[PDB]
Amino acid sequence: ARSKIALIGAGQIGGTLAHLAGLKELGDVVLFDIVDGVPQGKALDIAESAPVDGFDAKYSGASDYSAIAGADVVIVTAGVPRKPGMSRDDLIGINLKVMEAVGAGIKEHAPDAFVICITNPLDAMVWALQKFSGLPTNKVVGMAGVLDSARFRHFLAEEFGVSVEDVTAFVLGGHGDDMVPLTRYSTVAGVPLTDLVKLGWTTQEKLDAMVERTRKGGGEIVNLLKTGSAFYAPAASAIAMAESYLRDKKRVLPCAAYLDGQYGIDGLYVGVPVVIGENGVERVLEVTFNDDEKAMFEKSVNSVKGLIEACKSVNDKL
Amino acid sequence: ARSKIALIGAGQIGGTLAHLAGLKELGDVVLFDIVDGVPQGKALDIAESAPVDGFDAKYSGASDYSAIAGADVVIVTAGVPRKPGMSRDDLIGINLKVMEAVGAGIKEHAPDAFVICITNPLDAMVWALQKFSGLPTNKVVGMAGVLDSARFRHFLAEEFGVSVEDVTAFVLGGHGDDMVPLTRYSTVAGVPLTDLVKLGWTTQEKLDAMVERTRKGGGEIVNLLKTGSAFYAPAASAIAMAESYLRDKKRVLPCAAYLDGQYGIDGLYVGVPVVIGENGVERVLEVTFNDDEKAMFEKSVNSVKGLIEACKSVNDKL
Amino acid sequence: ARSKIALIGAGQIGGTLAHLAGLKELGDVVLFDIVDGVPQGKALDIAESAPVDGFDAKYSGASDYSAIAGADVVIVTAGVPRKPGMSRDDLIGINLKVMEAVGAGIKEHAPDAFVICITNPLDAMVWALQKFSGLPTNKVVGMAGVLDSARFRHFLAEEFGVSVEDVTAFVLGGHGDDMVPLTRYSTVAGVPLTDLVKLGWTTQEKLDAMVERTRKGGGEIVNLLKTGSAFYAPAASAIAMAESYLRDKKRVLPCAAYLDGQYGIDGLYVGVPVVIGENGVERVLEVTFNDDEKAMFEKSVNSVKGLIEACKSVNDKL
Amino acid sequence: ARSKIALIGAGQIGGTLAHLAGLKELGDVVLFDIVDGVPQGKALDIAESAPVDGFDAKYSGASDYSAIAGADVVIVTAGVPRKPGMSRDDLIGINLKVMEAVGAGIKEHAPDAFVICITNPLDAMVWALQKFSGLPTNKVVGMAGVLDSARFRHFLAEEFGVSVEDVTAFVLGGHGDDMVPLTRYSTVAGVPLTDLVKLGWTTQEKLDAMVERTRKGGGEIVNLLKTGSAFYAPAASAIAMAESYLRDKKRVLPCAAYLDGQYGIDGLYVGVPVVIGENGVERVLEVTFNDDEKAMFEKSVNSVKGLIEACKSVNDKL
Numbered sequence A, B, C, D: 001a002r003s004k005i006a007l008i009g010a011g012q013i014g015g016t017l018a019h020l021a022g023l024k025e026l027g028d029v030v031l032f033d034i035v036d037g038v039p040q041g042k043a044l045d046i047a048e049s050a051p052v053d054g055f056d057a058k059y060s061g062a063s064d065y066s067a068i069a070g071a072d073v074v075i076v077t078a079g080v081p082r083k084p085g086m087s088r089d090d091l092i093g094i095n096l097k098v099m100e101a102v103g104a105g106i107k108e109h110a111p112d113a114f115v116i117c118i119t120n121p122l123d124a125m126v127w128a129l130q131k132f133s134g135l136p137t138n139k140v141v142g143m144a145g146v147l148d149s150a151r152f153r154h155f156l157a158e159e160f161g162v163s164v165e166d167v168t169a170f171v172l173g174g175h176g177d178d179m180v181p182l183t184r185y186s187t188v189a190g191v192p193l194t195d196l197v198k199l200g201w202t203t204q205e206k207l208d209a210m211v212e213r214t215r216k217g218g219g220e221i222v223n224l225l226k227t228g229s230a231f232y233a234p235a236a237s238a239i240a241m242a243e244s245y246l247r248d249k250k251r252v253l254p255c256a257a258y259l260d261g262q263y264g265i266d267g268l269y270v271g272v273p274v275v276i277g278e279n280g281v282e283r284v285l286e287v288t289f290n291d292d293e294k295a296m297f298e299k300s301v302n303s304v305k306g307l308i309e310a311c312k313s314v315n316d317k318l
């Protein structure tokens, strides 16, 4: 009767997800990977940490999909990350094929799961995984905007010298160079950033620099680490989406969600604000854009369509 | 070397403060009261709960002010609460005299404390306590707006069917019938309430009703309980202010703060958004009002001045 | 789909239970009482605190038993507490009649609940409540030994100057003057207290005094407070039992449990170590006593039988 | 005024330490490493995660020791880990030289720190680091026994089907093949394992197998992962030691501590139960052994002396 969380991919993000699921006592955890030994190892290491922190959760590792049977939530990091110099879209060839296998494992063994996709390029990969798996669209989502928004919140907290708890950010669109941070709908304690520029708490130029740093955030971390990409903030972000589902919190979070008409878009995953509860993606919050925001969003969406055509370009079934 | 928190008043709020200080592992706790036995009892009861939850904190009870020596934070609930039918301003006669004694105990034994006043009527009582005690104005604050704002957040979370974590409220002014909730600076995930009315997520009339329910919130709880007033949400609210100080979080919180020129006011405590860190009230966020907000705020402040004149009206020293 | 916790009695312990259930995010809460207004008030006050701490839980108050429908856990504090000068057994007359009504409300509206009884005198009241309600015996338990054990742990932590996290206590029998703390099965970091006396970390006489202080602990708190009895540690204790059920933790806790043969006893509730998980009381840990421990336990059990005969003495159905 | 934690080594354990220090809100964090980019990257990634979980902590990365200035706690993982086939003692050549540099950085820039050493082989490395650094012996400790004990607790929790919170383990000696788990001082809820065998809750043979699995635990994880050694449980373990210091918890934990006469040993670090508070290692709990335990402990200590002679064998200063 505890919730069961299956982690497909037991790498950098996958391990961090497992550790956090325990610390937050979200349920039992299964780590799945094709490299044998790795998920069993990480599973046992985290299990062995549990008595120090006092959390009760069962941990196991597997390389067979039957291990995921009946999972309440499935989080997918399987595939490859970027190296310095690469865009996320350079990962499609390898990663699309991974989503195909993963999707078949979910369809067969955890068809009632809430599935959170992280593998990049995210808006394309999650669209793919939903098709391959055949799960209902409200039960399949992509983690991106919560990460982007959390980066922006960090930079803003630093700039204004305030608690991260009292900063809000709204970032929509692709998880891409062209994602759209909405300065008008980002706040300190409810006061929009555009108002804070007026009050002199910051400048326009500093605000623009933070928007740009947000757009380039993933790359900034790749360039520092060199051997891989970010994993702490991606993991935290997906975990918040998972907790909202498992605890029916109805968090409002920017996630790559399937649109049927919202924002005038039909049939794609795109980053938008969504309510997440026990029924999955329960509602999309459709804001009214001004002309500049609308332009940036249309462009972001065009990139996503570009990527989706590239996925079809290379795979029969899609 | 652990932080020491002194709780002046060991009643309904006082006990709840103590319990929360332990659960959040904020430090050692001293409960102070004039009714002997009560603070010792509550102290020992909470101490005895600690092994169940795993928090290490020393707890003691006293009716001598020397017990508070060297406290890092002092939270004052001493005095009397309302009964059904009373306004908060009916409490001045009794409560002003309490602040006089409390202020003298702080001045003598915990002069370097960060002091959070809760005793009502709050904007008057905290102004009094700061004068009686002589502590620097940035080290003395009133808990009110965080409570008011949290009520509004609850009502809003209910209305929109979203997580309390993703709702923001901005309530300024007196802790009074005329406090000012700013619908324009209250949000769901960064989207102002005024925009949500437009989007049809709620109505103007429902929004107005929630503003009113917020203004009358304290009374609503008095009328239900009958034997006393609210204590869980007041306690939680003060504890968040205390934690921001002790952990240097720089939370942005609406609190009754001493103004020297901000909002065009000099020499009063009034509810405004303030940054709280290791140096106390570190900054006041002065927003730009429209004409209606400015009118409501001027009125709220006039009530506060009314009450302050009533305190002088009845006490030589002030 | 969140768990639902019904709190029967919305007094001192009842309110504290509600507050803790939220803070630990255990589920939705219903407070039930016969004094109208009180459970609605406390419910709304805690609901209003929630945005400060970030927990999502629905709170309501009621005086009709239909409100408890479908509760996963029910915690019963309804009845009356002691005043200075009284034993717990002086509460039977009033409290037995309360258990009768409560039992009928559970039988009708939450027959699949895990029920934790707190109302005193506890070993008698829980035996009663199980009969009146007709629920399976593994789904009905009494909170006592966790409280007694936590008091002992506090006193021990103080004595040895160590963390409460690293102290263990084993207290069996009645929740009464004659409860049995087992010094041999109480420890600091795994080292029995009897060994610590030998090592000189404490003395026999200090150890005996702490055993006695534990036996008299409830009274010590009554005498301090004067208007009522302990509520923080009782509430924490029951909450740990509830969490073990709801999260299937399989905590090993001393609770008043129904015995069918364990410890050579059949047909009574007595304080023993039990494993609590998703199926209720899952196992009883039956330790081997030495002659002194066996004598103390037989006596404790005789008191419990005394009290049960007194309950039959005054009620047809039992 | 927040506590400052310096992490010397920003690898697998180092990163995990940083993440946990934030989640537990222990203070500001500096990650230090010789590979440039790595500590800056991990620091920024964790900083960027913070708004998701609500913790306020400053994070930075450095490859200059001046960055550690004034740290309250320093945790050292710098050096190299094992690959499959190696013992921990095969790491001395490289790691001793690392401790020399680290020790000089601490001596110069954080001489008032509480220093927790993790780098293997641990009992030798921490003895070295204390000499190189010259800090007082009560301010320098090795993390090992908490890890070993937590592995044993996991295996035991599994075996008995009980919560990890209610299992205790006592493991002394070297962090080595010959560490000494004390079955007599390990417990479920206060009942020794030797008593549980008698009660039939487990068998002698299963107990012996779990003792052995504990002794080989590090290797078991190396063999699974292949590219490195355990990091989640080592990190959790050190963090508990750090928290006990920073919050003056007085946890009783088995750690590699400097002995002056305890256990009849003078001048070495060996794994023993110690009280950790604001003054560092405050007390050693010296238990009385039976003849078998004494034999195992003397042997464990002889290995440690072996390793210390090997360190002198290869370095002038020691």
Ligand SMILES: Nc1ncnc2c1ncn2[C@@H]1O[C@H](COP(=O)(O)OP(=O)(O)OC[C@H]2O[C@@H](O)[C@H](O)[C@@H]2O)[C@@H](O)[C@H]1O
Pocket: A008, A009, A010, A011, A012, A013, A014, A032, A033, A034, A035, A038, A077, A078, A079, A080, A081, A082, A091, A095, A098, A101, A118, A119, A120, A121, A228, A229, A230, A231, A234
């Ligand atoms: N077909 C597969 N099935 C299951 N697991 C797989 C498969 N192919 C690869 N894996 C595993 O997926 C894991 C990916 O882990 P990392 O390489 O450490 O990458 P991480 O940093 O965890 O990123 C994972 C994904 O998330 C995105 O942020 C990133 O761009 C990448 O696409 C590896 O352990 C790898 O063995």
Ligand SMILES: Nc1ncnc2c1ncn2[C@@H]1O[C@H](COP(=O)(O)OP(=O)(O)OC[C@H]2O[C@@H](O)[C@H](O)[C@@H]2O)[C@@H](O)[C@H]1O
Pocket: B008, B009, B010, B011, B012, B013, B014, B032, B033, B034, B035, B038, B077, B078, B079, B080, B081, B082, B091, B095, B098, B101, B118, B119, B120, B121, B228, B229, B230, B231, B234
């Ligand atoms: N001079 C005094 N010094 C110290 N303590 C005092 C004094 N006078 C009264 N007290 C104590 O102050 C405590 C107040 O507790 P409660 O009556 O339970 O009131 P509570 O609900 O805790 O409200 C406290 C205060 O906060 C406001 O919200 C409310 O309007 C009231 O002013 C009581 O225990 C009372 O003995």
Ligand SMILES: Nc1ncnc2c1ncn2[C@@H]1O[C@H](COP(=O)(O)OP(=O)(O)OC[C@H]2O[C@@H](O)[C@H](O)[C@@H]2O)[C@@H](O)[C@H]1O
Pocket: C008, C009, C010, C011, C012, C013, C014, C032, C033, C034, C035, C038, C077, C078, C079, C080, C081, C082, C091, C095, C098, C101, C118, C119, C120, C121, C228, C229, C230, C231, C234
């Ligand atoms: N028949 C009833 N049905 C429902 N609720 C009832 C009934 N009779 C009384 N109550 C309520 O039970 C509540 C008991 O609360 P408190 O009097 O504050 O007592 P508390 O300290 O909460 O103790 C409760 C119980 O637990 C034991 O520790 C103690 O000895 C007492 O038996 C009160 O709010 C009271 O209105």
Ligand SMILES: Nc1ncnc2c1ncn2[C@@H]1O[C@H](COP(=O)(O)OP(=O)(O)OC[C@H]2O[C@@H](O)[C@H](O)[C@@H]2O)[C@@H](O)[C@H]1O
Pocket: D008, D009, D010, D011, D012, D013, D014, D032, D033, D034, D035, D038, D077, D078, D079, D080, D081, D082, D091, D095, D098, D101, D118, D119, D120, D121, D228, D229, D230, D231, D234
């Ligand atoms: N002289 C040095 N100064 C600072 N950092 C160093 C130095 N030499 C190596 N490092 C860094 O120490 C870090 C060690 O990290 P990992 O190799 O990932 O090893 P980890 O699993 O973190 O183990 C660290 C240590 O703890 C023990 O458990 C283990 O046996 C090893 O000795 C690496 O990032 C490495 O760059």
Ligand SMILES: O=C([O-])CC(=O)C(=O)O
Pocket: A081, A082, A088, A120, A147, A217, A218, A219, A221, A222, A229, A230, A234
């Ligand atoms: O950018 C990447 O390669 C990984 C990722 O999704 C992020 O860091 O934003």
Ligand SMILES: O=C([O-])CC(=O)C(=O)O
Pocket: B081, B082, B088, B120, B147, B217, B218, B219, B221, B222, B229, B230, B234
């Ligand atoms: O209103 C009162 O009497 C107590 C209080 O400050 C509140 O509930 O808002």
Ligand SMILES: O=C([O-])CC(=O)C(=O)O
Pocket: C081, C082, C088, C120, C147, C217, C218, C219, C221, C222, C229, C230, C234
């Ligand atoms: O003793 C009482 O009256 C209440 C109780 O159960 C305790 O404090 O032990």
Ligand SMILES: O=C([O-])CC(=O)C(=O)O
Pocket: D081, D082, D088, D120, D147, D217, D218, D219, D221, D222, D229, D230, D234
């Ligand atoms: O064994 C190792 O190499 C690392 C370590 O200290 C452990 O896992 O016990």
Ligand SMILES: [Ca+2]
Pocket: A053, A054, A055, D165
């Ligand atoms: Ca726990």
Ligand SMILES: [Ca+2]
Pocket: A261, A262, A263, A264, A286
């Ligand atoms: Ca539309």
Ligand SMILES: [Ca+2]
Pocket: B054, B055, C165
């Ligand atoms: Ca703890």
Ligand SMILES: [Ca+2]
Pocket: B261, B262, B263, B264, B286
């Ligand atoms: Ca101004």
Ligand SMILES: [Ca+2]
Pocket: B165, C053, C054, C055
């Ligand atoms: Ca939360």
Ligand SMILES: [Ca+2]
Pocket: C261, C262, C263, C264, C286
């Ligand atoms: Ca038997």
Ligand SMILES: [Ca+2]
Pocket: A165, D054, D055
């Ligand atoms: Ca927080």
Ligand SMILES: [Ca+2]
Pocket: D261, D262, D263, D264, D286
């Ligand atoms: Ca000795």
